[PDB]
Amino acid sequence: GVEFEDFCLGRDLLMGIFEKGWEKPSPIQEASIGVALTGQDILARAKNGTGKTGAYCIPVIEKIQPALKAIQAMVIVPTRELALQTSQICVELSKHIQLKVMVTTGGTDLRDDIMRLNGTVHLVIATPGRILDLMEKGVAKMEHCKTLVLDEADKLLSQDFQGILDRLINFLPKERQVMLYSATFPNTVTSFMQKHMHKPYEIN
Amino acid sequence: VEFEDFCLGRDLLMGIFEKGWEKPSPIQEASIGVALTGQDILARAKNGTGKTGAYCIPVIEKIQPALKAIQAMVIVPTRELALQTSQICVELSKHIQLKVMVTTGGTDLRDDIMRLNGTVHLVIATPGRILDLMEKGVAKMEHCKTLVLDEADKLLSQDFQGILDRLINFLPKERQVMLYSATFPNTVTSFMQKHMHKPYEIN
């Protein structure tokens, strides 16, 4: 049976995993974590549960350098509810790392977010509209953001979002890892992945 | 850049050090991390003990010594390469309770049978001899989840009877295949198409 120690995670992260009660990796975690740690793009068909979240949160947190005071990874979700669920898991998993997590879902005085970004932020969890606004204003600087997670990609690429995911991803460095998770794969998703991703590892 | 940077146990790291391999060669840097994730691998590489180490290191890392069953197999075209490779595996695994067996021409089948009655974790084979032992039911492959084909172009060239093609159907259908070859003629790419799954390509 595959163990979390089999991935060679930092001890601080391992303690957060153990202390959250995750003794052994779930199927989607075992399927994805090892490849995700290599840096290869990831294309995963997954339903909108929460084992999905651990599957991408663990590798995202592992490769963040907390001594580097810059945004190094970003998770994009379609809703506030999902942003809060994902943020809770990241905060829990990174309990023993000095990792600064920022959540924004808009609906607030933009100065709340500007205030936070003037400080140290390692990991951004966001709905796409507000964080794109912060990127276009130059408040969220993306030079070091080498990892992007798109969670519920079919929703994020729907008509609702009016093409802003394409504007968002164009701010990221060209050398970067994209992890895409989605329940369905219509033309919006497949055309996006062909344009922006590089020979991703596919996961059923 | 360093062997320590890959996810390898201290026991194997010691065997790599005592072999005198200071840092991974470029084929090793490019291979080891992906190999450890379980992905099929397609690697263009010319001959050397560096490509040998590129597949021997992750193969050894993933063997569970407490499981007394064949867990990986390496196929090479000559007895002499099998002997060189098994010796490297024994040296790399000096600090691990790992049992390595060679199955090639030049040994009595009665000897192979008696050895396979004991514990064998890793087989280094030429194709004809191991296929014979698998057919006889003596080399039991239920747990052999990793197969390496070294110098595939030579393995698949004169295989007019389809030995390799028949051999691979004795392995678990859920399996990792690592293929290394200097050239990629029709026989090699046809094998890849038929038996491998979306392999990670290395040049």
UniProtKB/Swiss-Prot annotation, chain B:
ATP binds at A45, K46, N47, G48, T49, G50, K51, T52. A motif (Q motif) lies at residues 1-29. Keywords: Apoptosis, ATP-binding, Cytoplasm, Developmental protein, Differentiation, Helicase, Hydrolase, Nucleotide-binding, Oogenesis, RNA-binding, Spermatogenesis. It is found in: Cytoplasm. GO terms for molecular function: ATP binding; ATP hydrolysis activity; mRNA binding; RNA helicase activity. Expression is restricted to two germline precursors Z2 and Z3 in L1 stage hermaphrodites, and is detectable specifically in the gonad at low levels into the L3 stage. Expression is significantly higher during the early L4 stage. In adults, expression remains gonad-specific and was not apparent in the somatically derived uterus. Expressed in germ granules (P granules); when associated with pgl-1. One of its GO terms (biological process) is P-body assembly. A motif (DEAD box) lies at residues 150-153. It comes from the Eukaryota. One of its GO terms (cellular component) is cytoplasmic stress granule. Residues 32-202 form the Helicase ATP-binding domain. Interacts with car-1 in a germline ribonucleoprotein complex. Interacts with ifet-1. Interacts with oma-1, which is a component of a ribonucleoprotein complex, in an RNA-dependent manner. Belongs to the DEAD box helicase family. DDX6/DHH1 subfamily. Probable RNA helicase required for oocyte and sperm function. Also required to prevent the physiological germline apoptosis mechanism killing essentially all developing oocytes. This is ATP-dependent RNA helicase cgh-1. It comes from Caenorhabditis elegans. The chain holds residues 43 to 245 of 430 of the full protein.
